[PDB]
């Protein structure tokens, strides 16, 4: 999805 979050995932591992 182009419109999905394109920033760092705040919940990344």
């Amino acid at each position, epitope marked *: 999805d*182009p*419109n*999905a*979050n*394109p*920033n*760092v*995932d*705040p*919940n990344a591992n």
Partner: antibody
Amino acid sequence: QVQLVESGGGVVQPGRSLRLSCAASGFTFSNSGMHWVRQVPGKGLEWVAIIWYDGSNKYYADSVKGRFSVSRDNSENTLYLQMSNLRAEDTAVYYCVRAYFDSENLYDYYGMDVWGQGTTVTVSS
Amino acid sequence: DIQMTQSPSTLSASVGDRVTITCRASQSISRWLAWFQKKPGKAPKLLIYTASNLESGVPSRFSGSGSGTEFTLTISSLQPDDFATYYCQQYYNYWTFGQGTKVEVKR
């Protein structure tokens, strides 16, 4: 203050290539998606490309697909737009635009928030 | 692809007027609509996001309404700083802009 400063615009002959740059400051550049948007004289604002924060995903408008490429260098806080096979319909002000930033990721669909002032590209012989 | 249409193209108004401008989407975009303000030769500024949510520092006199295909921006009492062109933008399916509404000084 979030600041985005485009550079690289100028005159370029039809069919040739030109690379634009955007110098980002006042936020963590490597955490933000980024966009290019243009405004051709006498036309509306036209989205050009997006690139993910980590460079892993990127999408283009049909009108530049196959000719333009977006990339970034997070270690230098710089966004790039490599243009090729330029034609008169590409004459425009090109803007660097930050994807909407949301540290809490509240919404599922993303727009854009802060714009640079633009760099002008003139495609002419 | 989704097309955005604004009306009117130009709105003549005076300081203190209530001003409403309209944006239509060719297909439903739910609440994924933004409003930007642009002055001549200057970068657009984001005013409203998620159709109705005012951005930080945006004055209380601005309001956005709508969900689906019909959207409005209202300025409850126009101020001198508000003469500008306003653009809507949908961010549901890629990103597309309306042609803009110029709010100009009435005389």
